């Protein structure tokens, strides 16, 4: 419960990463999916036997879990059976809250003695995210 | 469309498939394969039927 | 005349498919017991998902109080076959005709099977 990447244990050689996406988003909710990668024993033409997909909101990742459970996940002929994996593929945090878009960010130190601050430089638009579980 | 022949129909008040004529079905497994393939396994069954000709 | 038996419940299956017209090989943990089991079963015929609980006997004859070689309307997936290897925690090899069964558990609750023997596998699926 602590990330939101869910590894899928078997899935088909000769499927893509846009029949699976489809699959999920057909299953689960409307562009539920954030992130998808196969890893591929070669370059670009031999994936491996398992997946890797991220979900934007940890109640989707509960009812793929739930799915999972009950076997109710078919996609083509082959059961989707759904565990826990070690990394996320991108380092994004689940709550959309801590996303801070377009913010602006400045520099400086206490110059004064007083309640005082100095601006060096000041960027715009820079984004910010808030990692509670790498607490960075 | 997947049937090669004409032993499904569809109907347009219920909009939902009903079977016409199931003497034409020529036992071509196509529209069972093609359940398979959408990802319903037990979408339709079809059996000979073993006493009667 | 009942043997062995006990309430299992399937891990993981092998093939994991639900339309690939094979045999597939079932991973069932047996309850109270600690008894690990592979079979070979045939889903298109009894199908059996993950999750499910089902019931195990083995007898020697399926006829009461001897006549070895009426419990066929308690269970529904008789089998018959011959247990062939016996080594191991110990573990029984037995093929019904083909269909290989791995029955490993501990060596106290497997101790009256015989090498060469013919018996039968009753299953039901509650």
């Known amino acids: 419960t602590n990330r939101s990447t869910v590894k899928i244990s078997n899935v088909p050689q000769t499927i893509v990463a846009d029949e699976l996406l489809r699959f999920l988003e057909l299953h689960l909710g409307e562009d539920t999916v954030f992130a998808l990668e196969i890893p591929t024993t070669r370059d670009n033409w031999k994936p491996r036997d398992f997946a890797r997909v991220q979900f934007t909101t940890l109640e989707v990742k509960s009812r793929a879990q739930l ?10 002929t082959h059961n989707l059976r759904l565990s826990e994996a070690y990394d996320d593929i991108i380092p994004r945090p689940v709550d959309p809250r801590k996303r801070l878009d377009d913010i602006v960010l400045t520099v400086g130190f206490p110059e004064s003695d007083e309640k005082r601050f100095c601006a060096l430089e000041k960027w715009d638009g820079v984004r910010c995210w808030i990692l509670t579980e790498k607490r960075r | 469309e997947s049937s ?3 032993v499904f129909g569809m109907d347009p008040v219920t909009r939902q498939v009903v079977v016409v004529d199931p003497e ?7 529209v069972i394969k093609k359940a398979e393939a959408m990802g319903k396994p037990g979408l339709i069954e079809i059996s ?6 | 005349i009942i043997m062995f038996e006990d309430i299992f419940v399937v891990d993981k299956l092998d093939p994991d498919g639900k339309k690939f017209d094979k045999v597939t090989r079932v991973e069932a943990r047996s309850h109270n017991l600690e008894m690990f089991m592979h ?10 998902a993950v999750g499910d609980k089902f019931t195990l006997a083995m007898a020697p004859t399926l006829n009461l109080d001897g006549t070895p070689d009426t419990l066929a309307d308690k269970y ?6 011959k ?5 191991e925690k110990a573990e029984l090899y037995v093929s019904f005709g083909g269909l290989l069964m791995l029955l490993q558990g ?6 009256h099977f015989e090498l060469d023997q013919r018996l039968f596998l009753l299953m039901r699926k509650l």
Do not use: C
């Open chain 3, 83 to 87: 247990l062939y290897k016996i080594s």
């Open chain 3, 76 to 81: 529904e997936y008789i089998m018959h076959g």
């Open chain 2, 24 to 30: 034409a079905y020529t036992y071509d497994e196509e």
């Open chain 2, 48 to 53: 000979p039927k073993d006493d009667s000709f």
């Open chain 3, 39 to 48: 079979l070979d079963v045939n889903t298109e015929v009894y199908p059996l």
């Open chain 2, 4 to 6: 090669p022949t004409k």
């Open chain 1, 67 to 76: 799915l999972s459970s009950q076997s109710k996940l078919l996609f083509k």
């Open chain 3, 106 to 111: 501990d060596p106290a609750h497997i101790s």
